[PDB]
From Swiss-Prot:
The gene is glnS. This is Glutamine--tRNA ligase. L-glutamine binds at residues 59, 203. Its EC number is 6.1.1.18. ATP binds at residues 27-29, 33-39, 222, 252-253, 260-262. Monomer. It is an enzyme of class 6 (ligase). It comes from Escherichia coli (strain K12). It catalyses: tRNA(Gln) + L-glutamine + ATP = L-glutaminyl-tRNA(Gln) + AMP + diphosphate. The lineage of its organism: Bacteria, Pseudomonadati, Pseudomonadota, Gammaproteobacteria, Enterobacterales. Belongs to the class-I aminoacyl-tRNA synthetase family.
């Protein structure tokens, strides 16, 4: 329903375009967070809709590839459900064409070699306020430039002593159009060509050329690149290339209770404020996965954030998609988080097994859960006294143990400190509401309750990505769970009756399974 799909519709009928070819230019410098999901979703989604294509181009132009990110990014992308066209493209692939296309501009008197220092160039460029000035080298001959550029490429110039700039307009209302550098010198073995090159293209120049060569029909970038579009079109309109891809901008995702920066994040990771990048509190895709979030869940999310307003997404939106998703597919199960000892004195015999669904709404079958006279309950669920509102086990009353029998609070023992040490009560001959678990038949489980990473709605526009972090973004507690939670595979979630949605922590096992609380109940 967005303007983009409507513009693509256009260039589809009138004829401007035949199919559709998009791309996703991440960065082999970092990990994909939830913001990248939007671009990922628009570029690949749009491509599989009009039965067309979308490529994946990393930018290794910078001669420290740290081979892991590219594989990490590819994995994160397929997990989402998207597939990239052809092979994984690399900007370093195009060096020859970039280099030749730059010569072309030199021949048209549209590019020149500058020997003004990077500091001078910085000043001569002026500002949004003070106009810029032309380098005293700006009007050099087509032949001098041609010659000085080969000297550069041949290594005859020291670093910073020369660069090749586009000759556009120094009075331009767009700072990027004031003779932006196209090439710089760097005596340092790349890693895909090592010592083949001595000069390199600047991003802008490289980004637009790559798209053209890749047959990109529609090039989507966030709003911050709208000015760059002017250089982008300038370069394309001036070199001899077959197709001319157009740039359309979408807005950056602004998710409340989360920062969308490198500086911000990088700190966190490097401070133990999180267990690295995949941490369940992080906004990274890898981190949301370890949290319990599903691929279908993030995709469905992508649909609400862009399918124009005070466009500042609240966490409830992301939360809603996952709760709603795990609400229909996560088998049910029980577990106590604040275990308090409940014992029935009149419980005859040793034990039995009751019938418990796999989901209340059950083609999912069931499972036998042990029921003894020594059970574990949450201490949040007991109270010597409470008003009418209290919906649980009073001191002279009772409640119904899920899929079990009815209880009846009787005696209650304390300790030297005061905190109860073992509730007492009876039950009914047979009745076959609160969660519970057999003490004998129980799994000593670890429970990590997460929460929003920051105490402010907008940690970004906030003062500092620190003095505003949620101190208790995580609280680890040992709880007791049913044996059934022994087969639970990794990454799969379950709804723990009256507590929320949880999944086994992929990092921390066998004798001690760790459960991460993905999200809670809507209630």
């Amino acid at each position: 329903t967005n303007f983009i799909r409507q513009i693509i519709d256009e260039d589809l009928a009138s004829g401007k375009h035949t199919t559709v070819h998009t791309r996703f230019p991440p960065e082999p410098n970092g990990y994909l967070h939830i913001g990248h999901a939007k671009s990922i979703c628009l570029n690949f989604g749009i491509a599989q809709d009009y039965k067309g294509q979308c490529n994946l181009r990393f930018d290794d132009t910078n001669p420290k590839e740290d081979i892991e990110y590219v594989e990490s990014i590819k994995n994160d992308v397929e997990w989402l459900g998207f597939h990239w066209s052809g092979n994984v493209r690399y900007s370093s692939d195009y060096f020859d064409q970039l280099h030749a296309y730059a010569i072309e501009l030199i021949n048209k008197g549209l590019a020149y070699v500058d020997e003004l220092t990077p500091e001078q160039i910085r000043e001569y460029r002026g500002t949004l306020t003070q106009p810029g000035k032309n380098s005293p080298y700006r009007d050099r001959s087509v032949e001098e430039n041609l010659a000085l550029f080969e000297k550069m490429r041949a290594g005859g110039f020291e670093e910073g002593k020369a660069c090749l700039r586009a000759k556009i307009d120094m009075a331009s209302p767009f700072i990027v159009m004031r003779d932006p550098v196209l090439y710089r010198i760097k005596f340092a073995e790349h890693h895909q060509t090592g010592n083949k090159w001595c000069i390199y293209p600047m991003y802008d120049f490289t980004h637009c050329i790559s798209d053209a060569l890749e047959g990109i029909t529609h090039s989507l970038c966030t709003l911050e690149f709208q000015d760059n579009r002017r250089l982008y079109d300038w370069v394309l309109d001036n070199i001899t290339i077959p197709v001319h891809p157009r740039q359309y901008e979408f807005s950056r995702l602004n998710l409340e209770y989360t920062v969308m920066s490198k500086r911000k994040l990088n700190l966190l990771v490097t401070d133990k404020h999180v267990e690295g990048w995949d941490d369940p509190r992080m906004p990274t895709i890898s981190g949301l996965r370890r949290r319990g979030y599903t691929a279908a869940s993030i995709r469905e999310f992508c649909k609400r954030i862009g399918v124009k307003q005070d466009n500042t997404i609240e966490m409830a939106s992301l939360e809603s998609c996952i709760r709603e998703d795990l609400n229909e597919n996560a088998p049910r199960a029980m577990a106590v988080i604040d275990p308090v000892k409940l014992v029935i004195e009149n419980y005859q015999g040793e034990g039995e097994m009751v019938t418990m669904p796999n989901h209340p709404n059950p083609e999912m079958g069931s499972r036998q859960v042990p029921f003894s006279g020594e059970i574990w309950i949450d201490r949040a669920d007991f109270r010597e006294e409470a008003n009418k509102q209290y919906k649980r086990l009073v001191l002279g009353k009772e409640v119904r143990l899920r899929n079990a029998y009815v209880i009846k609070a009787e005696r209650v023992e304390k300790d030297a400190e005061g905190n109860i040490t073992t509730i007492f009560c009876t039950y009914d001959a047979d009745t076959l509401v609160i969660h519970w678990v057999s003490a004998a038949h129980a799994l000593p489980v670890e429970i990590r309750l997460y929460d929003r990473l920051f105490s402010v709605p907008n940690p970004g526009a906030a003062d500092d990505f620190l003095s505003v972090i949620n101190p208790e973004s995580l609280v680890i507690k040992q709880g007791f769970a049913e044996p059934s939670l022994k087969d639970a595979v990794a990454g799969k979630a379950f709804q723990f009756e009256r507590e929320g949605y949880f999944c086994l922590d992929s990092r921390h096992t066998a004798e001690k399974p760790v459960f991460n609380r993905t999200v809670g109940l809507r209630d």
